[PDB]
Amino acid sequence: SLAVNLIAIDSQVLCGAVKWLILEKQKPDGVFQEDAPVIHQEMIGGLRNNNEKDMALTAFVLISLQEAKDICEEQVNSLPGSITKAGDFLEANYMNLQRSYTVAIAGYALAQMGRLKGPLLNKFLTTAKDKNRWEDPGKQLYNVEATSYALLALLQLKDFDFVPPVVRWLNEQRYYGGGYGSTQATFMVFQA
């Protein structure tokens, strides 16, 4: 979805993968299910953690489909209905989340649809600590990965009073990507 501005990605194949994900790899209630995890388990980052895995995997694919919505909106007419089912599932079980990583990635998915409001928005804000990061206990690699999703959520919500401390904290980390198990952390931080 990012490389359509750089190289000629085939629209039929791209939307064919979207149609395959909607029809084959989506449960009727909105949950996306993976039937073959990748061999390299270090490239998935924080999604390797099996706690609250079903909610996090659903939000990851929902974000990917919404970013490719403009290209395959005309190709697949069931794309908005698929997003609606996934949004209702995430919205109903949003308040039960505990991990800061899961809340951050779900916040950006809900913010694109416009459902991150009220108590869901209050939970998203209070999840941050020191008003500049969304951190979980463990390696810094996962915390920067989670913070990248939340920074994109603030830009989606168009609330910039809280953004400068977040961006200032990211530069203070001096993270330059790369390294064993850095695929998701390196890719999302520079997108933000």
Side-chain angles (χ1 to χ4, degrees), residues 46-68:
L47 299 177
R48 193 176 185 178
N49 195 342
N50 295 121
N51 294 274
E52 301 177 343
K53 55 181 194 305
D54 300 77
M55 293 286 291
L57 177 62
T58 301
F60 178 84
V61 182
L62 184 60
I63 292 170
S64 301
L65 293 179
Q66 289 186 105
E67 289 183 355

Side-chain angles (χ1 to χ4, degrees), residues 147-153 155 167 170 186-192:
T147 305
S148 301
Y149 294 116
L151 180 58
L152 293 168
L155 293 166
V167 178
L170 294 173
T186 307
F187 180 72
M188 297 305 302
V189 63
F190 294 111
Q191 181 178 346

